Symmetry: none
Subunit: 209 residues, 4 copies
């Protein structure tokens, strides 16, 4: 039948996942890595999405700097970014509360607290939460965001996490491995070959590097 | 539109409940009284079930007394453990199957605990009733003969306790006299929740009885 | 000990009910009367619920008439579908949520169905009442404003229908006039079921609900 | 999040409706629909075999088949000689058999092609629920259980061999299932919207094997 897997990397990096106990390690590793990467995308969307809500679109990374120490185009809802990373020309505050709400919902869908609530995560639920944030983003900035905006990159899965503290979080499908009781399950074998056809199992995602 | 109600009587006597803001006050009050009564059934079920797990079935209420000071010789089974309160016979199940009962009681308490409010988890009648059914199932594995009609665990499992004259009667809120209170005033049963909370706004409320 | 009672009025009007043989006839008769009346409420709820599903809320009974020739102006909503009988407004819920209502109505019929006897499944008051509660919930999902006071679906969910003067009055067995018969004789309400059926018999017992003032 | 109604049509007897979000990949839709398809055909096989089990009891071991007359046989209380010689004849009591017979009809009805005309989409969960109900009826009527080779037991467990049978073409393992629309194969990596639009839509499709 089915097995309930508990991917636990840390007390904040963990989720539950349900699948066929007859499925390959290879297929399970890829599905859970896609879930894992979606969770951490959602965490980053919330930090950047809230900055977008306060201060509008990102400046291009080579053009950062705090506005006062520079001619500036000030729109109706202008709010100077103290970090100099966004233009300051935020959306109207009434639609901004909608954007903040879809971000809070998305984080809740993927939060570690879901493990206590015995709720397994799926790729489709995480992708659906990301799609709602995209919809809110299009309401507040119907023009769309620039190509370099971390919010846009997060919604598209196109961020480059190289050189950040977040690179270790990312587990690309081609190097993701799955470990149980401190040993690597071989991708070719079936989950039953390690766990039997008979309750929850703690496992851990890792990357070859 | 949905409303999240926070029934708060005290820091341990509280829960969340979700319903349509268009529902009548009366039907919400009845539904929440049933949720409330199940919570207190489960708390009593936990204290009594743990006594059942350690000491076996209840003595009939008129025949209580500690086994050693009884003129008659107590018929001691394999897992006999003298109840120091003299309320149960002492003839408990095997201690390893007893862990099944103890565990289902702990789960029932968890389903209904005040801790679920912090976890933002609303309670439902079916979830609380289902936890009681699991305790029933554990009881039938630990005592396959069943319990006597007077055993508080059986009565709790059945909804047949008589709490009159006890400290537990103030906990019980029968559907026909339960009331619902908001911002320190009693909501009228005829009205809809919307008449007090808006069509699209959480609301702290309080169950009381007439 | 327990007894399995087989209430059989007809091949469509029949159900199983299980109780302690030490129970009085009177209390068993009332319990079975509530089961019986719920079964027939559910059958009526299904006919009216599907009409509610297709055509929205009931017109007030004094203002019925087919929409096309109403003279009074008809408010056509997104899901307007003229009721060919002129009994409902036509303003149905969205059809994709309508299938939720239709499904709980079919589920209700299945809980109370005659087929439950062949499956050796006894009905209980609480299971049938729960099926009614589910149709209520689907109803409030499809019509969040609620139904008017006169809508037969609403009257069915509330158990407040008036069957006087209708074809359904012979079906209804109010608890205070319900009687219970076994082997062609009326059981006395004061007696225990065991007084007629024994303290232990492996066979079920066929009985029949009737109302005061009938034979067999 | 828009929804699409899919109509899988392989023939006028092999067809069902299926609902999902049009943003879903072809691959996951192909996989979920293959499971619906295989469950549909399991239930049809369970009905033919379950009804033989209802009339004639458990299957003889496949190498030991033969009509009882052409042999000395142990005749039980409800013995009814299987004219095909495939089952022992020692069926349960015929009125308890009605539990099985009615449950099989319900399961067949859940999955029947007629549900397409009734605009009713099938789900994996409803079809597995019907199978579980057949499991329950089976064990009310044969509490001793069925032998390992009984096709009813194999149908309930999903462990049949359809290789070399009329049913082999019916089986669509998820790993080789393809999905076809307007006479062409949809690419698994793509989204359903890429073929059917992102805006409330119905599409006839077809499951096939590589």
């Amino acid at each position: 039948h089915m097995v309930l897997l508990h991917m636990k990397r840390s007390e904040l990096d963990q989720f539950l996942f349900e699948t066929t106990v007859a499925s390959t390690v290879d297929e399970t590793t890829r599905q859970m890595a896609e879930v894992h990467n979606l969770r951490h995308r959602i965490e980053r969307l919330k930090a950047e999405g809230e900055e977008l809500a306060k201060h509008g679109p990102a400046k291009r990374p080579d053009q950062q700097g705090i506005d006062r120490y520079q001619p500036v185009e000030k729109g109706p809802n202008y709010a100077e970014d103290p970090t100099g990373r966004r233009t300051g020309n935020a959306c109207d505050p009434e639609v901004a509360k909608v954007l903040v709400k879809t971000l809070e919902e998305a984080v809740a869908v993927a939060h570690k607290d879901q493990v206590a609530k015995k709720m397994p995560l799926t790729i489709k639920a995480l992708q659906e939460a990301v799609d709602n944030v995209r919809g809110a983003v299009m309401i507040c900035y119907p023009m769309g965001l620039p190509e370099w905006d971390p919010v846009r990159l997060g919604l598209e899965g196109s961020e480059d996490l190289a050189g950040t503290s977040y690179a270790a979080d990312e587990l690309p499908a081609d190097v993701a491995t799955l470990w149980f009781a401190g040993k690597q399950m071989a991708p070719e074998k079936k989950l039953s070959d390690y766990l039997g056809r008979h309750t929850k199992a703690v496992v851990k995602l890792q990357k070859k590097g």
